Structure formats: C-alpha cells, structure tokens
C-alpha cells in the first residue's frame, strides 16, 4: 500500500483495524499479535456482516418496508442454510419463528 492513508483505508475495508488490533492485544488471547491478523479478522467480520445485511434487506423489501427490524433478520438467518448452521443455537429477540405447518395436520382433501 501507499502507507499514507488510514489503516482501514489502506486495506480497502470498512471495519476498523486499530480497534480490532487493540481488542486482540488487550483481550488476553496471546502474548504477541501479528501485524496482519487484525486486517484478516476485520475483513472476515465485514464480509459476514455484509452478507447478513444483504439478506435482511432483501427480506425487508419483499415485505414492503424500508427499515430492518429483528423480524427481517430472523427470516434472513432462518431461510438461509449456511447462516442457519452458523447461528443454530442463537435466539434472536423479538424475532419469532418461521411459518410452517406439518402435512398431517392439514385438512383432509
């Protein structure tokens, strides 16, 4: 890089790099922290947040809304498959449950 702009801008990211580095150092995770670890961690966090936010925005638009509410987040997480495994044990507050009814319980033809 040019070594002239801010650290977050040098790596072409949006999440902070200094804050992540400080959290890694003061978090009692290891005696030493490398110079490239916070950049990688910030990139991973930014990618995951972007994916979840994109899914939530699509869900909100499909529901005729303009503000991401917890219901949209729950729908986006549940309807996906990778994020469902990643967040299997997480309970989103004010989120509800996916709508489904078992086949047997439906009225007879």
């Amino acid at each position: 890089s040019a070594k002239a702009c801010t650290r977050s801008s040098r790596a072409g990211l949006q999440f902070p790099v200094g804050r992540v580095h400080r959290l890694l150092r003061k978090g009692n995770y290891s005696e030493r922290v490398g110079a490239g670890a916070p950049v990688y961690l910030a990139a991973v966090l930014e990618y995951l947040t972007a994916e979840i936010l994109e899914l939530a925005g699509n869900a909100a638009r499909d529901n005729k809304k303009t503000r991401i509410i917890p219901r949209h987040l729950q729908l986006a997480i549940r309807n996906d498959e990778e994020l469902n495994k990643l967040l299997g044990r997480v309970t989103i507050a004010q989120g509800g449950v996916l709508p489904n009814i078992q086949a047997v319980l439906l009225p007879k033809k």
Partner: protein
C-alpha cells in the same frame, strides 16, 4: 340456524395468525412476580432491572416454543395429533435435559 365452525379450522387459523406475529404471549406482571419470587427464594432483598426481566421472558418463551415444536413432532410420530405429557417427557429425555 346459528353458524359455527367445525372443530379444527379455528386452531389452524390461530396457528397461522400467531406464527406470523412476534409479540410476547405471556402477561408481563405475573411473569415478573414469578421471577421475583424465585429470586427471593435464592437470595433475599434483590432488585431487578427491567431489561433483565424482559430478557428472561424472551428466553423462556423461545425455549417453550422449541419444546412444543419437538413435542408436536413426537406426537405426530406415534400416529396422533394431540400432544401428551409422555411426548414432552420423551423429547426432554432425547434432548439430554433430564436423562
């Protein structure tokens, strides 16, 4: 002459209505009083933040919803549609909660 629905349709309508919404389903004051009673049983003279009560209520509601989902699956597995105490007991035993 009076019109009434056959038993079963209102249950499906209620299921469809409740799965769509996200509001709380237990009255706030009874739950708060129950939590206070349990805490005072544990330690005397305790004060509760409102957010703590809300978090406890949300966690309990989510856990009960999951337990009822598992119970419904167990009841369906045995060629039935009603949920019975043995279904809840079997679900809890398989989940490892009580062994």
């Amino acid at each position: 002459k009076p019109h009434r629905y056959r038993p079963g349709t209102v249950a499906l309508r209620e299921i469809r209505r409740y799965q769509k919404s996200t509001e709380l389903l237990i009255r706030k004051l009874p739950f708060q009083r129950l939590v206070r009673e349990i805490a005072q049983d544990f330690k005397t003279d305790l004060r509760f933040q409102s957010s703590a009560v809300m978090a406890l209520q949300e966690a309990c509601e989510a856990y009960l919803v999951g337990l009822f989902e598992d119970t419904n699956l167990c009841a369906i597995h045995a060629k039935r549609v009603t949920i019975m105490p043995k279904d809840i007991q079997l679900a809890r035993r398989i989940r490892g909660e009580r062994a």
